[PDB]
Structures are given as C-alpha cells and as structure tokens.
Design a protein around this ligand. Structure first.
Ligand code: NFU
Ligand code: SF4
Ligand code: SF4
Ligand code: F3S
Ligand SMILES: [Cl-]
Ligand SMILES: [Mg+2]
Ligand code: NA
Ligand code: NA
Ligand code: NA
Lengths: 599, 270
C-alpha cells in the first residue's frame, strides 16, 4: 500500500481481472483490488498490444509517414495523418493554403462527430442501458418520454417504438443473443426505467444506420473512409467549379458535403446531446457520481481549431494545463519544450539508457522489453495476475512537467470553461453548452420527469464519469457547428478566386534543409495528440508519437504516480465484484483506444 | 437459425470493423440482426473478461464445424507472442484454438491476409498473416486497408446464401471482387492512354483530373473493386478524390518504395 495524488492505493483486498476489456478499440487488461465492501482500492491498466510504428518509420520518406501512422487507428481515422503532415510541414517550414486548412478542419470535425456518436451508442451505451429491460417497456410511455427528452426529434410515435421493441424481442427469443450474449442485464448497477432503455436502444439502431452517411465527407475530400488520404503541403482534392466534373472538388461535391453537415447538426442536437443529458440526469439522481479521477485536479490539451490559421491565440478549443483543481490558472503548454511533455518507461515494456528520467519525444526511444516482475502469478505466456510493481504495460507513461494529467473532451471543456471565465471570447460556446447542460441536469429534466431538483455546480458535476460522457457529447455538437462555418468560409474563399489546395515549393527533398525537426499536434477525439519528427538527409531519423490514450491509459511513472484510467476506477463500489459493470462504465467514459495508445 | 460468426482481433487498427459497419447494401444492422449471429466481437459485445471468453467455448461446442471464424488483424510471433495478449495468453493460441472447429475462415483486410503495416520492415513483432499460421483450414483473403464495406458484407452474403466459399484466385481472393486491377476501369484511363499526367500537386493537370501515374499511383498493379464499386456507397475512391492508389490491397505494399515514386516501365500498363 502507498498514497499518491490523494489516492490511497491498497492491493491487500480481493483481486479481480478483466481480460479482455471489450467495447474499446484494441487490447486492454484491467485488474483491480476491492475491499471488504466491494470498493475499488487499487487499479491496474495494462495495454496488451504493440506493433512498433515508431520503429518501422525509421529511414523512410517523411512524405510517406502520414499513411503509415494513419494505420495506428481506424477508429480515430485520419487524426494521425493530420498530426504527421503538420509535423513534416513544421519541420520544413511549409505553410499550407487556406483551402487545404479548411478542408483539413472539416475532415477533423467530421471525425470528431462520427467517433464521438459511435462511441456513445455502440460502445458506451450498454454500460448505462439494460437491453432486456427495454423489452418490458411500454411503447406509449416511451413515446411520451421521447417527446419530453427531445421535442424536435420526429421519430417519436408509439407504433415506431413498438416495432423496434418487437424486432428486439424476436431477436432475443431466437436464443441467439449475439452481441448481448452473457451480458450483465438485471444488475442493480442499471437504474434506468424500461422506457428510457427502449428509447436508447432505438437510438443505438438509428445511429448505426446514420453514421455511415456522415463519413461521406471524408470520402469526398480523401477518397475513402476509413483511412482517407492526406498530403504534405495541402490536400490532394484539387478544385474546379467550371470541365468541373473532372476535378475532385466542384460545387456539386461541396453542396453534398453541406447536406451531410446539416444532418450531423440535427443528430447532435435532437438525438445525442438530449440522450446523454437524460441518462446523466437519471444516474446523477441515483447518486452515481464516481469516476472523476484526475479530472478533479490535472487536465491538459494542446489547444485546437484556430479561427485564424497559424494563430494559436484564436483556438476555439483553447488549451493549456490546469493543476491541483485550480481553474483560475491555465498554464501554457509548449510541445517544443524538452521539460514539459516527457515519457517514462519505468513500468512499461520498453528500455531506456536511464529509466529514472522521462524523454521528450524528439529524444524518444522505442526498444521493446517484455519482462514480468518476480511477484507475477502465472508465467510469461499465461498471466493470472500482473505484477504492477514492475513493468506491466505496452503503454508508455507521458507526464507534463512531471505531473500526471487527464486528456480528452472533458479536459478540453474544463479548459474552455477556465479560459472563458479568464475573458477568452473564443471559448464562449463551450461555456454556454456547459451552463445549459448543468441547468438541464439539475433542474429542467428533473422537473419534467417529476424528480427532485439538485444544485450541483460544474466544479462538482464535471469531474465524474457522467461529466466525462457529457463533455464528449457537447464536443460533438460544437464540432458540427464549427465545420458548418468552415464550409461557408471554404466556399467563400473559392468564389473569391482562390482555388489553391497545395503548396509544392518544398515537395522535392532536394529543397529541404539537410537536418530538421518538427512537431504536429491535434485535438484528437480522445485528447491531446502529438507527433515529433527528426529528418536527416531526406529520411526519418526519429519519429515519436504520444497519443491521447497513451496519457490516459498509462501505467505508473518513476515516482509511482498513477494515470487517468487507474485514478478514475479508485474509490468506486461494485455491486458484484465478478461483474465488471462499473469498471466498464468508467473505463469506457475515456473512450479507450488501445492501438492508438501503443502504436 | 443464423450462422455464428466469431470475430477475433489480433494486432490491428480496427479499421476493418469500421469499414464493415459502413455497409449500405446490406446494412450492418440487418447483417447482425437477421443474417449472422455475431457471438464474439471485442468491439461491440456486451460481455467482458471471463464472460466474453466463455462464449467461445459454448458456440464452438454447439456449432462445431458450422461457425465462421473472422479474423481482423494478425498474430505476432516475437516477444513470445505477448505483443498481443488476450486473457493473459498469446493471441496466436486463441487464433489456433478457435480455428480448429471453424467451417470457414475469413482473413479480413491486408493485416489478416498479408501482414500490413506492422509487418512492414523491420517487423519488430514478427506479425504474420493468418494463412501462414493456420495451414489446414479453408481461408478466404479479403484484402485492402481496409477493404470496401460492400466487399466485406458481399463476401458474408455469398457465404450465407450458398453455404460455400466463393471462387478464389490463386492468391485466395474472391474473384467476384478482386478480378480487376484499379487501372483496368479507372475513369482517368483516357488521360493515361493519351499521356496526360499530373506532374506536381495542384497543377493545371490535377485540376483537370489527369492521370496520377507520375505522382506514384499503384493502380496498375493493384487488384480491388475501387474503380467500379467505389467507397462509402459509391461516393468516391482515392483516385477520384485526387490521390494515387497506394496499393493497399496488395501483399507488401508498404515496402515497395515511396508511395509517390512512379512505377517503372509505363509501356507494360498500356
Ligand atoms: N482519438 C484518438 Fe486515437 Ni484511435 C487515441 N487515443 C489518437 O490520436
Ligand atoms: S487491414 Fe488496415 S484497416 Fe484493417 S485492421 Fe489492418 S491496418 Fe487497419
Ligand atoms: S495510373 Fe492510376 S490514375 Fe492513372 S489511369 Fe491508372 S489507376 Fe487511374
Ligand atoms: S489505395 Fe486501396 S482503397 Fe483502393 S484505390 Fe488503391 S486499393
Ligand atoms: Cl501488406
Ligand atoms: Mg510513442
Ligand atoms: Na493543418
Ligand atoms: Na463551478
Ligand atoms: Na501523374
């Protein structure tokens, strides 16, 4: 047992293993210890995969890198490509043209919406929603609930919910439950009434059908989704309005993109945000405010979406770092500063020359070292209980000036709120969303459902699993709104006579400095993403990625400080220690991307 | 009753799963609810840990030699297999276990088919395609990074309708989707045939949709349905949106030089 960051870690209790953690991207093992009352008193995050993209990139052409690193992840598809081209452009002093900037922003915001909405419905919802309870639901009361939760949503009749319920019923009655097989249905951890469950399962099906439409924006600008194409110096989708039919981008294609954006805005406003507000209200009413972890103290993001390209003061999700829960002081974050972002491997399956220090990613090293501690139960190829006192993960341990930080939509929304209260006008919309949401969760939704009103502040409400889930939905909404504006700015610029999509002045390596270093950062769906590159004689000398789930899922550092996943699970009661419902609910609120975390 | 599918994940990016759910004809929703029984799939399944792993035994017993094993990603052989761990054990052990009683095996994407990005030089995990580990079972390769959504669901649809593996080429790929090279029917072919090429990004030739061969297009040596079926319900494909094919459905496509290096001997593709 030891204390760190206000958490009293104790491994003397009952050990519980969850391997595989499902409804995430990639591979994770989680172990916890619970006390005599089933409360988690220790948590252990183990990334259970590695591919070695950083090693693979050595010696290759910087212009090709984006395609390799894009394949770090097909869920957050394209965010690595964006970080890569930004890193190479930074290294080589390449400024992209305005249309390329706007198209990249539209692609980024399309990813945000798609990733966020799919995560909530298809990965997260089954931690809050009991699908078997939905079978008990009354269709008319579900219709009435739908009308209260979101008046504007046109799919609300009793017959519609009855039809959906019927298909679910015969599916379950078949004896082949598929994705619902061996679920934790009927657990007391589930608190929603039947009608809320039916509403949510209905929206799961709606979202599954609609999500394929949204990505057609990527398909137009980047050829395909997953894994749309990017380009060092701009975008490949050349513009001609007019022989306009022959160009990748013409007015007809742009009108198609706008139609898709408009649909996204309707979905976020009428389906996603209302569902999260309603479910959050009901779990708040049940008192389930666990899972805050590091969000209550330390949050970080690089900052993203500047109104004016290459002008960081205009970031519409303004970033920085907050420490010790002091929201009155946002520290600036510099990805070039060797003393700020650093990665430790003390408790990771890698080796450094000196593991007492963390390396800034321009000096990063990726050499595998799969070895298990002496206190392991089982063998090298058959682990029963991992030894977290030694090396226990394929995930490195990123820290900021030595501090363990949470990253993600919640971090960005806390930062935005802090910035807005400092006078930052660029953060006004997220502040509005948060104050609206608190009022809905505390007063409006309880009043509509006949529940008592509460008086939680944002400071109390946001650092929680509910808060983390809320921030993701609000971020989706904001991203949809922002790309709506980006689209108008793109079309305006093209009509003004600027059709440029690529700067090729430094495309040829004969024009490059013989040595160079660059960094590219991205507010990826799961948090702060950075790629750091060193170029030598036209080739990749070093390429290091520090990815959002690397931050959140990290194992302990040299000082023994815990990362966001481990902190978030602490101090959470489990209804049944051998049903990981609470563990899944909170882990999933980070939207873990394990292939990203390890790359 | 609906045919069980056990969908395993090795080393992967999860892009093949994502492509699968983009399918418009049929909808993934209808595939899951009315066509297959998707009994194991880490991306979507409700159960975790012990409850998840217990599903494998139950389906293998009840549907012995009558379930489909679908594999996304691949097994690593280095690090004693523990660069991909499932249930505290190497992924390769799960793959071999589930493979033994499958009616058929689908290698989704270039990872399962060939090795893909993690197998690119110097392959630090010795990631290995499924067919080099499972050597005594019928396998269908469905390559691409990821494959087109309707190709993935098209394979499933054929297998369920006929209870047969579709006709395969010598590389193990379904002829119904992989008989053509991109370059065979690419809409930019009349420019290629007339020696009309993009030479620099966003040059006048690029704005007129000229051929992408000299910008590194690997369409002439890449078998896939992209030029006809296209992507995301026929919305576009890489070449239509302005970037050359990078050869993503072909064995070893990461180690054939820069994506922007043109193929040599242009006369052979005329
Ligand atoms: N968002 C995201 Fe990825 Ni699949 C993570 N973590 C990215 O950078
Ligand atoms: S084939 Fe490509 S898209 Fe599919 S899992 Fe592998 S890297 Fe990802
Ligand atoms: S080289 Fe590429 S762009 Fe040109 S015709 Fe062939 S497939 Fe199309
Ligand atoms: S890069 Fe891949 S998606 Fe098609 S056009 Fe080429 S085979
Ligand atoms: Cl390959
Ligand atoms: Mg890294
Ligand atoms: Na950019
Ligand atoms: Na507050
Ligand atoms: Na060309």
């Amino acid at each position: 047992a030891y204390a760190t960051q206000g958490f009293n870690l104790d491994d003397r209790g009952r050990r519980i293993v969850v391997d595989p953690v499902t409804r995430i991207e990639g591979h994770m093992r989680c172990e916890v210890n619970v006390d005599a009352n089933n409360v988690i008193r220790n948590a252990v995050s183990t990334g259970t995969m590695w591919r070695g993209l950083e090693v693979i990139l050595k010696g290759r052409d910087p212009r090709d890198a984006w395609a390799f690193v894009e394949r770090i992840c097909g869920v957050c598809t394209g965010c690595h490509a964006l970080a890569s081209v930004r890193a190479v452009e930074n290294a080589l002093d390449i400024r992209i043209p305005k249309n390329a900037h706007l198209i990249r922003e539209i692609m980024a915001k399309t990813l945000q919406v798609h990733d966020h909405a799919v995560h909530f419905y298809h990965l997260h919802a089954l931690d809050w929603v009991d699908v078997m309870s939905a079978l008990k639901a009354d269709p008319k009361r579900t219709s009435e609930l739908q009308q209260l939760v979101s008046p504007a949503h046109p799919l609300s009749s009793a017959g519609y919910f009855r039809d959906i319920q019927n298909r679910l019923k015969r599916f379950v009655e078949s004896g082949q439950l598929g994705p619902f097989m061996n679920g934790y249905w009927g657990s007391k951890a589930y608190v929603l009434p039947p009608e809320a469950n039916l509403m949510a399962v209905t929206h799961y099906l709606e979202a599954l059908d609609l999500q394929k439409e949204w990505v057609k924006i990527h398909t137009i600008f980047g050829g395909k989704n997953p894994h749309p194409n990017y380009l060092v110096g701009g975008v490949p989708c050349a513009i001609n309005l007019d022989g306009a039919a022959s160009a990748p981008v013409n007015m007809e294609r742009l009108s198609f993109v706008k139609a898709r954006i408009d649909e996204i805005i309707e979905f976020n406003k009428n389906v996603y945000v209302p569902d999260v507000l309603a479910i959050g209200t009901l779990y708040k009413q049940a008192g389930w405010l666990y899972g805050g972890g590091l969000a209550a103290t330390n949050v970080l993001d690089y900052g993203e979406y500047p109104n004016v390209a290459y002008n960081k003061s205009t970031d519409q999700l303004p970033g920085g770092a907050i420490l010790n829960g002091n929201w009155d002081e946002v520290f600036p974050v510099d990805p070039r500063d060797s003393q700020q972002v650093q990665e430790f491997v003390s408790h990771s399956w890698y080796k450094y020359a000196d593991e007492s220090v963390g390396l800034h990613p321009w000096d990063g090293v990726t050499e595998p070292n799969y070895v298990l501690g002496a206190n392991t139960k089982g063998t090298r190829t058959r682990i029963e209980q991992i030894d977290e006192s030694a090396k226990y993960s394929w995930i490195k341990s990123p820290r900021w000036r030595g501090h363990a930080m949470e990253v993600g939509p919640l971090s960005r929304y806390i930062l935005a709120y802090a910035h807005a209260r400092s006078g930052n006008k660029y953060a006004e919309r997220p502040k509005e969303q948060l104050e609206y949401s608190a009022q809905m969760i505390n007063s409006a939704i309880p009043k509509a459902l006949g529940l008592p009103e509460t008086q939680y502040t944002l400071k109390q409400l946001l650092p929680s699993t509910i808060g983390r889930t809320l921030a993701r939905a609000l971020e989706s909404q904001y991203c949809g709104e922002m790309m709506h504006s980006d689209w108008h700015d793109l079309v305006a610029n093209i009509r003004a006579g600027d059709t440029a999509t690529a700067n090729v002045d430094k495309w040829d390596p004969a024009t490059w400095p013989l040595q160079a270093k660059g960094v590219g950062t991205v507010a990826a769906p799961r948090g702060a993403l950075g790629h750091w590159i060193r170029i030598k004689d036209g080739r990749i000398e070093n390429y290091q990625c520090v990815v959002p789930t690397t931050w959140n899922g990290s194992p302990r550092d040299y000082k023994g400080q815990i990362g966001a996943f481990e902190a978030s699970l602490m101090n959470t009661p489990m209804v049944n220690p051998e049903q990981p419902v609470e563990i899944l609910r909170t882990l999933h609120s980070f939207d873990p991307c394990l292939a990203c975390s390890t790359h | 009753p609906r045919t069980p599918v056990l969908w395993l994940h090795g080393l992967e990016c999860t892009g093949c799963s994502e492509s699968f759910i983009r399918s418009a004809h049929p909808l993934a929703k209808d595939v899951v609810l009315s066509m297959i029984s998707l009994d194991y799939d880490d991306t979507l399944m409700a159960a975790a840990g012990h409850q998840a792993e217990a599903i494998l035994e139950e389906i293998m017993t009840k549907y012995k030699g009558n379930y489909i094993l679908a594999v996304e990603g691949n097994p690593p052989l280095n690090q004693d297999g523990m660069s991909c761990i499932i249930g505290g054990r190497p992924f390769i052990e799960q793959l071999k276990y589930v493979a033994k009683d499958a009616k058929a095996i689908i290698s989704w994407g270039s990872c399962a088919s060939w090795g893909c990005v993690q197998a690119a030089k110097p392959n630090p995990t010795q990631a290995t395609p499924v067919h080099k580990v499972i050597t005594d079972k019928p396998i269908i390769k469905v390559p691409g990074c990821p494959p087109i959504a309707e190709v993935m669901t098209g394979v499933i649809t054929y297998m369920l309708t006929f209870d047969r593996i579709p006709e395969l080429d010598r590389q193990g790929r379904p002829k119904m989707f992989y008989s053509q090279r991109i370059h065979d029917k690419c809409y930019r072919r009349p420019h290629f045939d007339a020696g009309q090429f993009v030479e620099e990004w966003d040059d006048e030739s690029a704005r007129k949709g000229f051929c992408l061969y000299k910008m590194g297009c690997k369409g002439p040596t890449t078998y896939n349905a992209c030029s006809t079926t296209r992507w995301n319900e026929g919305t576009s494909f890489p070449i239509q949106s302005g970037h050359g094919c990078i050869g993503c459905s072909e064995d070893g496509f990461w180690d054939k030089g820069s994506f922007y290096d043109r193929l040599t001997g242009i006369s052979q593709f005329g």
